[PDB]
Write a protein that binds this ligand. Structure first.
Ligand SMILES: Nc1ncnc2c1ncn2[C@@H]1O[C@H](COP(=O)(O)OP(=O)(O)O)[C@@H](O)[C@H]1O
Ligand SMILES: Nc1ncnc2c1ncn2[C@@H]1O[C@H](COP(=O)(O)OP(=O)(O)O)[C@@H](O)[C@H]1O
Ligand SMILES: Nc1ncnc2c1ncn2[C@@H]1O[C@H](COP(=O)(O)OP(=O)(O)O)[C@@H](O)[C@H]1O
Ligand SMILES: Nc1ncnc2c1ncn2[C@@H]1O[C@H](COP(=O)(O)OP(=O)(O)O)[C@@H](O)[C@H]1O
Ligand SMILES: [Mg+2]
Ligand SMILES: [Mg+2]
Ligand SMILES: [Mg+2]
Ligand SMILES: [Mg+2]
Ligand SMILES: [Mg+2]
Lengths: 541, 538, 100, 520, 155, 51
């Protein structure tokens, strides 16, 4: 009676494998395990959300409130959390907006299922309850859109899209950060009377170059690109040359050599005297045809030899390394030229135009300015950030990346429209799901009623992070929808929130319709997987 | 959820705990599977101290060998308590509990709840009690048949030993229980029969003695070894150095007083010796032919042994406490504590008193009593384990025969009781029984588990257990329509059936009644246990 | 149903990860910045005093301003690195008042 | 470092979450131990024994649980046992669910614990009135009504097969100990067990069962009218508190010392023979010299007796314990003893003392039990203590509460009706109490194998219209009424389940931080 | 007599190895029996690298989880060969092997020799192949109807 | 395949307990164990026996 039988299955599989199955654990146990990371995201939600410091094993510190970025650098042993982590990764890759909503909504769907399983409701009927409730949710989101806009052009129309996204991240800056993104989008879009057929837009058109030092208000928008390099051979001519042709060469500038390793073979000394001047006049012939075409700038991705740099310095031709290939195609879009691997001679149709180039120090380090005024740019821009700390500017770059991601999600489909924010949409969905359960009798009513309860976390998080009571302001919000003016009721964050009612159209805080549709589908599927896994199989280490 | 309550704990529940009771009881039954039956295997136990235990009893195997599995601990405590009261049924309960768990485990895998399975065990067991009244055969003790006690005693003897030691020990056990039966009808098993281990000759030379034998003998040479007529005087008072009460002591003024005070130690000893001499003055008639002996419960001072030597009085010291209670049954006298009041009536009588000195130890033999009320059994063996093998074989045969004289009924053996319940439980209408629906299944698991014991007997004989029971069921089919009531047994010699009444195979009534009742409660509590955990402060 | 013996619980975060939340974490983060400030308090002013710092390589470096002082010592705690960034940003952009 | 402190300090909401999760795991182990279909739990002690029972009291007692909050749930087992003895499993399951069901909030609503505690005090007061209204009084003088009442705790145990025989043993044991208000105690009830035998042959016998055989062969083992006298002093020679240290000058003085020791003990034996007792019981050891003069007069000698058994012998025969032999009188001699006999059992001897049965001091009785093994005896003994404790509540409290989960569900319906009428900030903690009360009848469905969704939905609907006696059937898992179900339970059991569970939940809600291993 | 050949050699003879084949197959079946049917359980395979795989098929489960018991290796290699040609039947074969052993193990304890037990398997299997020809229904695939292929593919 | 089941349900007894039966040549090993000490007393038999 001292020792246990050890079970016969101990010899089966291995000792490193661990098993969690129905009645063996999990079943609202593992749901209580993700509540630690769920509470982590609850404090980071909203404009009052709290950033979180994460130190990776490498030592790099990433401070942000984005759930997709935080869960990426964290090593998590619990497997079912990765279902929620990978759910937030899809939100950042495709839409790029709503990562915090997916983790919070999917976490509450597992919390409201705690009462369902405790009542004896099998997980088979729970999956059918959320699937039928998700289809009814997506169908009711179209009738609530008052923000349908056909423009997507004027800068003031972006104040209802880009600005509300920036309001949450780095709430300390509103008009400063919104002007940087709105001006960068106006530059990358082509100027035309009517542009149809869904003009192409990508996240690579707007870039962020972070420079240490300086206030955020001192930041500006540059149509070109700002890279940190060392110019060589001469000082720029400023505007004396006006528009100058820029030739981008993929291959380096040097006498063409074979891929195989060659060497010089000299039979007699007669070829030795001509070997010195031979390499000089050979490369000079290809460099002379470039100066005849009026090319003041040459960009060669690979390393340029000193023999090629000697000739280009006297003619006043700029040389820029650009080691990275990814940034090489970005300078080509500024001037609008064609990258040429061959040397040959520059053709007029394949050469671009740059208004001016200058070398200045924004933060004390010399950088080259590609800014082009009056010129024609296509899908290119940059945003120079000025900040005292490097970690604070890290989330600002992600806030800009999330701001331009909304433009990509707005432009690519027919449209993203708008939705009322600040807890206005989440409360309206509660009355829709609640009444939907009473229309169809059955055992699924328990899963439908609890599906609407999980929508209460979003509007109260704005009140919880504002230092407000969720038993007063939140219950008084439902009475404001009693009945247009009843759809615009929302959560107020202010010392004046005691009334609990602030008009949303005053500050114009709106959310994308396509973002909420993609966030609910991922959050519902993520919570469905946790409830659909009956047995867990682990491994050693 | 136990890992949150305790940092380190071990637990197994549901299917993990269901394999605990089924598998652990399967390995324990397999050890005693080859034990059951007269042809069963013989096991020897050797511990780290060097002792040797050689016996076929399943109780010695459980007590000597430790068991780590907690499931078998419940079975070991149940099999041990079965041999305590009934002297039999140790290996029977183990085969019942271990098999009933496996027979009920097949339906647990089918989705049947354990409670409704255990509920059918009680319904099926209560019918075995109602059938037990018609199954038992009444025996009247007024006939005083000696042949009946011979066949019943051989049931336990043929199992433990072969026919060589059975023929020797059969009349010994019968002659022992013959004096147990009295007009009072009260049967006292402990005082009537004892087991005394002595190594002499061979184990097959064991003989029966009609009077008490003691482990002590005369220390002084002049003490008569053989006394024709001896009067046994029971003395529970000890003559020897006493505790002296904190040892106050003597103080002498002169050297003449030193030896004068030393004689006071013999003043108290000789005071009680004069009473024995005065008692001898009454029996002094025919002193050369007769004799006077003294048996003391406690050690006697060697200073006083020379007093009994001059009077030719045999003295016995350091006797056992239980032996003092039997001196009234053997000799016929009474016990005497204080020597102040002495009478010839309390003196016993013996026709032969002799001592046999073997080695350093000396033993005193008493026999030839007028109306002896008790007897003894002298166990002889070649080796230390041979003394224990006969001790466990005779003692288990004592309770078997003693339980026969308690009641008026006797149960036939040879698996006739287990086969009869199979046809009874399977052919009984369920409307008469209180079990319905799924509870009908639990009764079938109890009836099938009872057929393994008659099959286990055949496994030791080498014959196929399935083919030998085919002829048993075919005989009971035509016996009901032929107006003939006959019990069918199992004969392992020829591999055919037999009749326990003609062959002489009988089993005690209290053994099978307490075995089924005991085995049912063990297996029921194990099937109703869905979790096994270990927690405690150490 | 279980594999064998007992199964221990799985910790959410990796074993060895230090995580703490609540008001006690912010106070610990502020005390990390104040402790670094205690060294730069006497350095402020024309009468301020220099700080002698020896690294693990036994390389002697003396700097009065707080920009180089924070570069010599290797900062671990995250909140204390914030005071290092503002010292290097003030040095590169302007270079005066890095201690203030 | 500072003092003894820190390490990892759990603060904030996660300290209360750890208190709820750990306390919830306590009720999850015995969750299958509730109901008539309840399974069994085998426990392994460090001493090497075995404990197999379905009672949550004995399960949580031997299990070692190391945790600040989870140990408080272990203390609730002895609260129900020592005060009542029935319902120990119900309290742990209820208190475990209350902490989870009444306080999921502060993870969400951030409601202060004291605000919840103020609602728990008002919910406990209203819960007692609901139980008093659904309780119908029952006559305590009806033997047929007490038999079906004892079977309430028997229906969930293994002795339900013998329940017809078990109610005969529990009714006669409580009625005998009852003294005329009607206060009884189990200290005089003997738990002594007999290994082996048939359960049907077990019966409650008046008197005290001794394991000791008569000392001398001439002691009569059969006496028609035994007369028992209790002696605390040993019959041996008392040395005394101080050393005697006799200085013996003459050789005749030493023999007188040993001669008086025979006469001094004889003097104490002659004073005993004045009342001519047939049976003499001595608490301490007895010399072989004292038994002879007692045998000459007819007195019987026995082995030394523990102090616990001396108190039960004096109650049966009416004897008075007499330490001083000189003060022994005929008034303190026990009489009215039915029979004195000794039966042979292989393990030990057994001595029987029968009462003549014919207000005075309460009578004592022993309960003989014949099991199948040694561990089966310990299981029925725990079943008798739970069954006999039910008869103690009905005598002191004639009120009779509804069983079969009808008490907890009746409260949950009344709490839900008053939750909407109360409104205020306390409506959430007050309504959450009703959700924890319906978990106990929900466990009856999970163990029976039915659907708790459809059964509990019809149970709440039929509770208002049909009657307050509607409850869950254990065996069939159907909807039946306790009137036709024939089994009821006292109100004291239900009152202790509601009070102990709520008062314990208020203690765990007040915990802020937890520090382990401070000092000893 | 095996230790006389090698000191480190171990063996289990007669019923010692027989209890292994019955237990190891029953333990492997008990894990994979919950995956049989549309209502079956879903297993989550998590290795040391952190990869998560959700599948109800026994081919992936037995491949990712290494089996220490030699008896269950024969079942794993048999279920693997079943998935190669037929692409289906991994869980079915595992449930049959463990059941054929448990049903036959009950007769072995009754004194039945395993040789005649293997005879009853081959004689009854050949009769099942003859019944398989009469039980199957021939279909006409020349029409290329969708409704017939939708129901078979949905199953 | 790497490690044996190592005699399942062997925890019924202590690890120090071993079971030897007449089967598997142990009754032959027991007779062979006698011959180890048997030849010791063979050379000591008779008047020419060796001490
Ligand atoms: N100044 C403000 N006043 C009131 N509500 C605000 C303010 N700024 C942001 N919010 C609300 O806070 C919420 C933050 O949501 P957010 O995490 O940005 O959603 P997503 O995860 O889709 O980016 C928004 O829905 C917005 O309505
Ligand atoms: N010589 C025999 N022939 C047939 N059956 C026998 C023989 N000896 C014993 N048995 C049967 O074996 C069973 C067990 O006997 P025994 O070994 O004395 O009890 P236990 O097995 O409980 O120790 C008895 O029920 C009896 O019927
Ligand atoms: N001549 C001065 N009179 C008064 N205050 C001064 C004078 N020079 C410097 N200070 C003050 O002393 C502070 C520290 O100056 P210093 O240590 O020289 O450079 P830093 O400001 O970079 O630390 C400054 O904030 C300045 O206001
Ligand atoms: N046969 C039954 N059917 C339904 N409910 C029952 C039955 N027996 C007991 N109960 C319920 O189980 C609860 C506890 O009873 P019981 O198990 O006897 O005590 P404990 O839980 O302390 O062992 C009681 O409140 C009662 O309502
Ligand atoms: Mg956002
Ligand atoms: Mg026997
Ligand atoms: Mg300065
Ligand atoms: Mg009870
Ligand atoms: Mg398939």
């Amino acid at each position: 009676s001292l020792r246990l039988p050890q079970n016969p299955n101990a010899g089966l599989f291995k000792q490193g494998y661990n098993s969690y199955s129905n009645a063996d654990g999990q079943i609202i146990k593992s749901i209580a395990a993700i509540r630690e990371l769920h509470q982590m995201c609850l404090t980071s939600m909203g404009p009052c959300g709290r950033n979180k410091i994460i130190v990776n094993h490498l030592g790099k510190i990433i401070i942000t409130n984005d759930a997709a970025t935080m869960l990426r650098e964290l090593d998590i042993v619990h497997p079912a959390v990765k279902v929620l982590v990978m759910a937030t990764e899809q939100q950042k890759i495709d839409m790029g907006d709503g990562t915090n909503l997916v983790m919070i909504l999917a976490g509450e769907l597992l919390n409201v299922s705690e009462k369902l399983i405790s009542m004896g409701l099998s997980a088979v009927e729970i999956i059918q309850g959320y699937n039928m409730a998700r289809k009814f949710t997506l169908k009711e989101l179209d009738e609530m859109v008052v923000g349908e806009i056909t423009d997507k052009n004027d800068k003031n129309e972006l104040l209802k899209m880009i600005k509300p996204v920036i309001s949450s991240k780095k709430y300390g800056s509103e008009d400063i950060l919104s002007e940087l993104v709105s001006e960068a989008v106006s530059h990358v879009l082509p100027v035309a009377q009517q542009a149809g057929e869904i003009p192409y837009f990508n996240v690579d058109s707007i870039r962020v170059v972070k420079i240490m030092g300086g206030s955020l208000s001192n930041s500006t928008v540059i149509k070109g690109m700002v890279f940190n390099r060392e110019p060589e051979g001469h000082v720029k001519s400023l505007s004396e040359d006006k528009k100058h042709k820029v030739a981008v060469f993929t291959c380096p500038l040097d006498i063409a050599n074979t891929e195989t390793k060659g060497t010089v073979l000299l039979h007699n000394a007669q070829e030795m005297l001509d070997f010195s001047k031979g390499e000089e006049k050979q490369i000079d012939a290809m460099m002379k045809e470039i100066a005849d075409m009026g090319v003041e700038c040459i960009v060669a991705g690979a390393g340029v030899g000193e023999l090629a740099l000697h000739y280009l310095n006297r003619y006043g031709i700029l040389v820029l390394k650009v080691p990275s290939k990814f940034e090489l195609r970005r300078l080509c879009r500024v001037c609008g030229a064609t990258p040429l691997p061959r040397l040959g001679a520059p053709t007029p149709e394949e050469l671009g135009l740059v208004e001016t180039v200058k070398t200045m120090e924004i933060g004390g380090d010399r950088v080259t300015v590609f800014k082009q005024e009056q010129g024609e740019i296509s899908r290119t821009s940059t945003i120079i950030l000025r900040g005292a700390t490097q970690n604070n500017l890290d989330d600002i770059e992600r806030a800009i990346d999330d701001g331009v991601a909304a433009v990509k999600g707005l432009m690519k489909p027919s449209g993203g429209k708008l939705l009322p924010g600040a807890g206005a949409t989440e409360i309206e969905l509660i009355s829709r799901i609640t009444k939907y359960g009473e229309r169809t009798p059955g055992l699924l009513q328990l899963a439908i009623k609890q599906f609407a309860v999980a929508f209460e976390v979003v509007p109260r998080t704005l009140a919880e992070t504002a230092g407000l009571d969720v038993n007063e302001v939140l219950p008084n919000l439902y009475a404001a929808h009693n009945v247009t003016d009843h759809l615009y009721k929302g959560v107020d964050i202010d010392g004046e929130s005691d009334e609990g009612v602030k008009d949303i159209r005053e500050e114009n805080i709106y959310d994308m319709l396509a973002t909420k549709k993609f966030a609910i589908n991922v959050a519902t599927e993520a919570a469905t997987t946790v409830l659909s896994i009956d047995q867990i199989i682990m491994a050693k280490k | 959820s136990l890992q949150l309550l305790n940092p380190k704990a071990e637990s197994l529940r549901r299917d993990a705990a269901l394999k605990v009771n089924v598998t652990s009881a399967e390995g324990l039954q397999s050890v005693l599977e080859t034990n059951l039956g007269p042809k069963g295997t013989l096991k020897m136990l050797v511990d780290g101290a060097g002792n040797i235990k050689l016996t076929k009893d399943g109780k010695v195997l459980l007590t000597e060998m430790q068991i780590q599995s907690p499931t078998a601990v419940l079975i070991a405590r149940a099999a041990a308590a079965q041999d305590e009261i009934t002297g039999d049924g140790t290996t029977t309960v183990v085969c019942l509990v271990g098999e009933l768990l496996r027979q009920a485990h097949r339906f647990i895998q089918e989705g049947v709840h354990p409670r409704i399975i255990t509920d059918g065990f009680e319904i099926a067991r209560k019918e075995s009690m109602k059938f037990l009244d018609e199954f038992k055969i009444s025996k009247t003790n007024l006939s005083n048949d000696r042949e009946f006690l011979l066949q019943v005693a051989r049931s336990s003897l043929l199992t433990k030993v072969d026919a060589d030691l059975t023929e020797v020990l059969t009349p010994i056990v019968t002659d022992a229980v013959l004096s147990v039966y009295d007009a009072q009808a009260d049967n006292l098993d402990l005082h009537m029969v004892e087991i005394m281990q002595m190594q002499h000759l061979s184990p097959k030379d064991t003989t029966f003695i009609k009077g008490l034998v003691l482990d002590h003998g005369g220390r002084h040479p002049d003490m008569p070894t053989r006394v024709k007529n001896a009067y046994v005087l029971i003395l529970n008072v000890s003559l020897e150095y006493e505790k002296t009460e904190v040892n106050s002591g003597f103080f002498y003024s002169s050297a003449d007083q030193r030896d004068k005070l030393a004689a006071s130690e013999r003043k108290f000893v000789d005071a009680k010796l004069k009473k024995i001499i005065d008692l001898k003055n009454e029996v002094c008639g025919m002193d050369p032919d007769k004799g006077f002996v003294i048996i003391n419960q406690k050690g006697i001072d060697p200073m006083s042994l020379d007093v009994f030597a001059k009077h030719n009085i045999l003295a016995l010291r350091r006797a056992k406490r239980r032996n003092m209670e039997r001196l009234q049954l053997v000799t016929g006298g009474e016990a005497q504590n204080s020597v102040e009041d002495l009478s010839p009536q309390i003196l016993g009588f013996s026709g032969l008193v002799y001592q046999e000195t073997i080695g350093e130890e000396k033993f005193t033999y008493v026999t030839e009593n007028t109306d002896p009320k008790s007897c003894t059994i002298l166990i002889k063996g070649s080796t230390h384990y041979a003394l224990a093998q006969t001790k466990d074989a005779v003692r288990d045969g004592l309770r078997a025969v003693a339980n026969v004289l308690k009641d008026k009924n006797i149960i036939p053996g040879a698996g006739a009781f287990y086969i009869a319940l199979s046809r009874y439980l399977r052919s009984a209408n369920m409307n008469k029984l209180g079990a319905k629906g799924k509870t009908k299944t639990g009764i079938e698991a109890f009836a099938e588990a009872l057929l393994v014991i008659p099959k286990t007997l055949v496994k030791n004989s080498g014959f196929d257990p399935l083919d030998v029971l085919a002829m048993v069921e075919d005989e009971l089919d035509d016996a009901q329509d032929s107006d003939e009531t006959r019990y069918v047994g199992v004969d392992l010699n020829i591999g055919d059936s037999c009749d326990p009444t003609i062959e002489g195979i009988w089993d005690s009534y209290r053994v099978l009644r307490n075995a089924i009742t005991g085995a049912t409660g063990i297996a029921s509590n194990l099937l109703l246990c869905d979790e096994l955990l270990r927690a405690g402060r150490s | 149903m279980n594999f064998g013996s007992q199964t221990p619980t799985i910790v959410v975060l990796k074993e060895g990860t230090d995580a703490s939340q609540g008001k006690g974490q912010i106070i610990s983060n502020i005390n990390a910045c104040v402790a670094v400030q205690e060294a730069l308090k006497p350095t402020l002013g024309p009468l301020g005093s220099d700080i002698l710092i020896v690294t693990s390589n036994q390389k002697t470096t003396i700097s009065n301003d707080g920009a180089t002082i924070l570069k010599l010592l290797d900062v671990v705690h995250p909140a204390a690195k914030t005071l290092v960034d503002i010292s290097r940003a003030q040095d590169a952009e302007v270079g005066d008042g890095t201690t203030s | 470092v500072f003092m003894n402190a820190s390490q990892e300090r759990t603060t904030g909401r996660q300290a209360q979450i750890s208190n709820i999760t750990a306390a919830k795991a306590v009720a999850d182990v015995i969750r299958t131990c509730l109901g008539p279909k309840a399974m069994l739990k085998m426990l392994l002690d460090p001493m090497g024994g075995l404990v197999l029972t379905n009672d949550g009291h004995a399960i949580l007692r031997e299990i070692d649980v190391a945790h600040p909050a989870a140990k408080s749930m272990l203390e609730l087992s002895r609260t129900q046992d020592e005060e009542v003895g029935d319902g120990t499993t119900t309290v742990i399951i209820l208190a475990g669910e209350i902490l989870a069901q009444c306080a999921p909030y502060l993870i969400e609503k951030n409601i202060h614990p004291v605000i919840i505690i103020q609602a728990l005090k008002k919910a406990l007061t209203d819960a007692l009135e609901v139980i008093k209204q659904v309780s119908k009084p029952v006559d305590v003088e009806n033997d047929a009504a007490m038999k079906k009442l004892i079977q309430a705790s028997i229906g969930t145990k293994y002795v339900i097969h013998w329940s017809e025989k078990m109610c005969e043993l529990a009714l006669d044991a409580v009625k005998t100990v009852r003294k005329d208000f009607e206060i009884d105690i189990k200290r005089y009830v003997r738990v002594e067990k007999i290994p082996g035998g048939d359960v049907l042959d077990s019966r409650v016998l008046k008197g005290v069962l001794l394991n000791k055989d008569v000392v001398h062969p001439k002691m009569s083992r059969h006496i028609e009218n035994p007369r028992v006298v209790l002696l605390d002093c040993p019959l041996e020679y008392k040395k005394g508190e101080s050393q005697t240290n006799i200085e013996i000058e003459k050789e005749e003085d030493w023999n007188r010392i040993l001669q008086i020791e025979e006469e001094q003990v004889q003097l104490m034996c002659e004073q005993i023979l004045a009342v001519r007792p047939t049976l003499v019981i001595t608490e301490k050891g007895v010399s072989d010299l004292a038994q002879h003069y007692l045998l000459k007069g007819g007195c019987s000698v026995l082995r030394r007796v523990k102090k616990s058994d001396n108190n039960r012998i004096a109650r049966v025969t009416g004897a008075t314990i007499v330490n001083r032999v000189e003060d022994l009188k005929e008034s303190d001699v026990g009489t009215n003893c039915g029979l004195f006999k000794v039966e042979m059992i292989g393990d030990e001897y057994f001595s029987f003392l029968d009462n003549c049965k014919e207000s005075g001091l309460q009578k004592a009785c022993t309960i003989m039990l014949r099991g199948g093994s040694k561990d089966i005896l310990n299981e029925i003994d725990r079943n008798l203590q739970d069954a006999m404790a039910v008869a103690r509540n009905v005598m002191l409290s004639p009120s009779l509460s509804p069983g079969g989960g009808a008490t907890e569900m009746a409260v949950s319906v009344k709490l839900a009706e008053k939750a909407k009428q109360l409104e205020g900030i306390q409506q959430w903690p007050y309504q959450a109490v009703a959700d924890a009360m319906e978990c106990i009848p929900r466990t009856l469905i999970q163990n029976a194998g039915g659907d708790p969704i459809r059964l509990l939905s019809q149970l709440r609907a039929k509770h208002a219209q049909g009657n307050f006696t509607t409850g869950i059937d254990g065996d069939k898992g159907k909807i039946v009424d306790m009137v036709s179900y024939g089994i009821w339970e006292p109100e004291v059991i239900k009152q202790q389940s509601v009070k102990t569970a709520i008062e314990s939940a208020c203690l765990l809600l007040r915990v802020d931080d937890i520090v382990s291993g401070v000092r000893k």
